């Protein structure tokens, strides 16, 4: 699971809400550790 | 019952160091947690610090960070702690008490090709019996 | 995560119900829904004793006179018929968050 | 790893322990969730 | 992650650090289960 914000400033408004900015806890390639990471995606790539 | 033990009250010149120990019977730490506490006469209760009773975990109450350690004769009979810096102030009736946990899984992803990843934590649930204590106090 | 208790001492009237407050920055709920509260009780002259805990159930050998409520950052310890031998201080516990933690405490004494 | 018990609901006497309730902690599709999960199954495909 | 020691058996001392001893929890025949198994290695084969 994704944890998310609506991606803000610089953009046109007819833009607004197309972009989501979300975070993962997913795992480092060692199978025993964890980092956090980012992404840009649309909206359109995800559901609640 | 398991009975408990603790080292005799002492006396201590200021700004020094002091130890004490405690003892289960039964080698009863095994199953419990160690917990040491401290109390001043007309004061309420002050937890010091822990140790798991698999004793894979320590800790201390965050006044205590530095001047306080806790070692166990092996196969976990008894237990000990060393405290530090000691000054009048410090003067309190310290004790050792037995005590349980729940340890649950805090967070996990499921590993399809090996261990699963995992976060653990422990929560202290009570207090178990109270050790009969020792007097501590600090003059020249 | 800090914890507080009131009142910071109670006279009773003996034979009466009373009770006593804890309150705390968090929640003493957990995600598995657990709760990590518990009571203790010190007479004087005496180590303390555990009365509730979990803030769900008495801890055996209790009298049934100890109840207790609340959920959230609040949570109360309550003795129907407070007796004479109900004198002493009062400690809430927090196992939910490191480092552990005790309550100022309250202290029960008989009316005068 | 599995939880089970023996089903004696609505069952001919000599068909006893022929099959056991079962659950588990097995996951939910979500890498981060898991659900609890049971079923019946044969006592021939189970060992304790 | 593995821990490991300079473990030695009568080792020449032209060989000293050569071999490590190491361990882990593993996986196990279930996924609930985890258990510690430790081998020898070669240098070459890890990095700190
Ligand atoms: C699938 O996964 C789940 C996790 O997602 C597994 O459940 C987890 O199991 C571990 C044990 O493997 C538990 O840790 C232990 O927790 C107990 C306390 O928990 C008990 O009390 C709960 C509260 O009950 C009151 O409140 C509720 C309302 O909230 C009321 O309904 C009740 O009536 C009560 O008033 C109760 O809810 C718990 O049940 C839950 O868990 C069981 C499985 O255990 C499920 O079947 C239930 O459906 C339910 O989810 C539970 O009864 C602690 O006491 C334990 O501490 C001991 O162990 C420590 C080492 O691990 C040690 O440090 C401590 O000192 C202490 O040691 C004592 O006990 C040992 C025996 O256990 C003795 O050997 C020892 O000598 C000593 O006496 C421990 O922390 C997790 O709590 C539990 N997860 C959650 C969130 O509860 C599930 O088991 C998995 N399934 C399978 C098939 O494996
Ligand atoms: C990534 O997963 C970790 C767990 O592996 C998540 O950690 C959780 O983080 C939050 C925020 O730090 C912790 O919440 C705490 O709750 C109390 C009470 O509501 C509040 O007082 C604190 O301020 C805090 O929010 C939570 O306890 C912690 N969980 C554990 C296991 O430590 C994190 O949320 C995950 N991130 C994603 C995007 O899901
Ligand atoms: C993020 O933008 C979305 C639209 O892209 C906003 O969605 C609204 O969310 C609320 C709560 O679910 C609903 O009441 C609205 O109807 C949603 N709008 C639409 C277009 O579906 C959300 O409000 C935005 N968040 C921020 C902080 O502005
Ligand atoms: C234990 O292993 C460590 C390396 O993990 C060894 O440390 C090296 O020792 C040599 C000799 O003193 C130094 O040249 C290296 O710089 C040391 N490495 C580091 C990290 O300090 C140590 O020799 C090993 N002990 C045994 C008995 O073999
Ligand atoms: C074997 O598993 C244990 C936990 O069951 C691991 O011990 C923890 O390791 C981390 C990393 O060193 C420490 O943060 C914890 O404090 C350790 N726990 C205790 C009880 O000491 C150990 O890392 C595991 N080994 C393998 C190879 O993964
Ligand atoms: C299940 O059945 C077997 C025999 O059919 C019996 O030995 C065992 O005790 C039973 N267990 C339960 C929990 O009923």
Same mark, same amino acid.
């Given at each position: 699971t994704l944890q998310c914000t609506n991606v803000t400033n610089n953009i046109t408004d007819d833009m607004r809400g197309e972009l989501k900015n979300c975070s993962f806890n997913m795992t480092t390639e060692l199978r025993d550790k964890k980092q956090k990471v980012y992404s840009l995606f649309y909206r359109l790539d995800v559901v609640q | 019952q398991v009975q408990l033990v603790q080292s005799g009250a002492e006396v201590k010149k200021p700004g020094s160091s002091v130890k004490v120990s405690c003892k289960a019977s039964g080698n009863s730490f095994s199953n419990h947690d160690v917990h040491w506490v401290r109390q001043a006469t007309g004061q309420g209760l002050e937890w010091m610090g822990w140790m798991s009773h698999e004793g894979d975990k320590t800790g201390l109450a965050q006044k205590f960070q530095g001047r306080v350690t806790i070692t166990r004769d092996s196969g976990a009979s008894t237990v000990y702690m060393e405290l530090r810096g000691? +000054?009048? &102030? &410090? +003067?309190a009736i310290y004790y050792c008490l037995t005590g349980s946990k729940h340890r649950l899984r805090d967070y996990f992803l499921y590993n399809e090709y090996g261990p699963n990843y995992e976060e653990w934590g422990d929560y202290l649930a009570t207090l178990d019996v109270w050790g009969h204590g020792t007097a501590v106090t600090v003059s020249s | 995560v800090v914890i507080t208790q009131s009142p910071l001492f109670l006279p009773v009237t003996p034979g009466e119900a009373a009770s006593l407050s804890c309150k705390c920055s968090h929640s003493l709920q957990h995600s598995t829904g657990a709760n990590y509260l518990a009571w203790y009780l010190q007479r004087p002259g005496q180590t303390p004793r555990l009365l509730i805990h979990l803030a769900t159930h008495r801890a055996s050998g209790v009298p049934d006179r100890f109840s207790g409520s609340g959920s959230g950052t609040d949570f109360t310890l309550k003795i129907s018929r407070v007796e004479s031998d109900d004198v002493g201080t009062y400690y809430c516990m927090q196992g939910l968050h490191s480092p552990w933690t005790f309550g100022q405490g309250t202290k029960v004494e008989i009316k005068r």
């Amino acid at each position: 699971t994704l944890q998310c914000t609506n991606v803000t400033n610089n953009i046109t408004d007819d833009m607004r809400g197309e972009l989501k900015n979300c975070s993962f806890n997913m795992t480092t390639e060692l199978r025993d550790k964890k980092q956090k990471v980012y992404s840009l995606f649309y909206r359109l790539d995800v559901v609640q | 019952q398991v009975q408990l033990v603790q080292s005799g009250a002492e006396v201590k010149k200021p700004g020094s160091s002091v130890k004490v120990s405690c003892k289960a019977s039964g080698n009863s730490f095994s199953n419990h947690d160690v917990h040491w506490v401290r109390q001043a006469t007309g004061q309420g209760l002050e937890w010091m610090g822990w140790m798991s009773h698999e004793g894979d975990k320590t800790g201390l109450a965050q006044k205590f960070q530095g001047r306080v350690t806790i070692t166990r004769d092996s196969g976990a009979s008894t237990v000990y702690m060393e405290l530090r810096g000691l +000054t009048a &102030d &410090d +003067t309190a009736i310290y004790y050792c008490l037995t005590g349980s946990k729940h340890r649950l899984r805090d967070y996990f992803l499921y590993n399809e090709y090996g261990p699963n990843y995992e976060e653990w934590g422990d929560y202290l649930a009570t207090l178990d019996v109270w050790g009969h204590g020792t007097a501590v106090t600090v003059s020249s | 995560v800090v914890i507080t208790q009131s009142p910071l001492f109670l006279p009773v009237t003996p034979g009466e119900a009373a009770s006593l407050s804890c309150k705390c920055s968090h929640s003493l709920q957990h995600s598995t829904g657990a709760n990590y509260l518990a009571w203790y009780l010190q007479r004087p002259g005496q180590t303390p004793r555990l009365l509730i805990h979990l803030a769900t159930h008495r801890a055996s050998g209790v009298p049934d006179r100890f109840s207790g409520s609340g959920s959230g950052t609040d949570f109360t310890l309550k003795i129907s018929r407070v007796e004479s031998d109900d004198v002493g201080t009062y400690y809430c516990m927090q196992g939910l968050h490191s480092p552990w933690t005790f309550g100022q405490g309250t202290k029960v004494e008989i009316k005068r």
